[PDB]
């Protein structure tokens, strides 16, 4: 069994996609659930898990079966505990895009996540580990990571810093190897 990963902080998305592509035998994504009606070319259980009934899925959310859910384009979407458990029981590390709130939910589910926070040193530091964002978004993001650390600090399995994203990817890599 392999621990699910949650990367938080700036660069999470890039880190996640990199990991997925770079080591697809080591890493996987879980199948999310949606109440949106399945397009004809879509495959139930691969692209999404397609729920017949919005009332149905609201119940499961109520029933705690999901670690994350929200609404988009008027439909529910979410990550079930079970779809994470399937990846993790596949011997693969499940790459999660989820809020820090999800970690308490993962701990609670016995799924023992690996939660990694990426801590910017300064506003400027954010810009140096992130090429393609504006100065305003860097600001909004530094303040964001601060509020995140204040609240969720006790949830982090580990905290990384760096001058370059490359340095950080390397660090994120080590941490993951170290826990297995």
């Amino acid at each position: 069994y392999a621990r699910p990963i949650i990367i938080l902080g700036p660069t999470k998305d890039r880190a996640n996609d990199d990991l997925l592509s770079e080591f697809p035998d080591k890493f996987g994504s879980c199948v999310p659930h949606t109440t949106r009606p399945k397009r004809e070319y879509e495959i139930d259980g691969r692209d999404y898990h397609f729920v017949s009934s919005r009332e149905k899925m609201e119940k499961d959310i109520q029933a705690h079966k999901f670690i994350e859910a929200g609404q988009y384009n008027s439909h529910l979407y979410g990550t079930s505990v079970q779809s994470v458990r399937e990846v993790a029981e596949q011997g693969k590390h499940c790459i999660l895009d989820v809020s820090a709130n999800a970690v308490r939910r993962l701990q609670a589910a016995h799924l023992h996540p690996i939660a990694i926070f990426i801590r910017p040193r300064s506003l400027e530091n954010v810009l140096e580990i992130n090429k393609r964002i504006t100065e305003e978004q860097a600001r909004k993001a530094f303040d964001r990571a601060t509020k995140l650390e204040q609240e969720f600090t006790e949830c982090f399995s580990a905290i990384v810093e760096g001058d370059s994203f490359e340095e950080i990817y390397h660090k994120v890599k080590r941490v993951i190897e170290d826990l297995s």
């Binding site: 949606t34 949106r36 879509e42 691969r46 609404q71 988009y72 384009n73 979407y77």
Partner: peptide, 12 residues
């Protein structure tokens, strides 16, 4: 071939 699940990433 696998879906890009854009709705999902897009979700708030």
């Amino acid at each position: 071939k696998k879906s890009l699940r854009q709705s999902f990433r897009r979700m708030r």
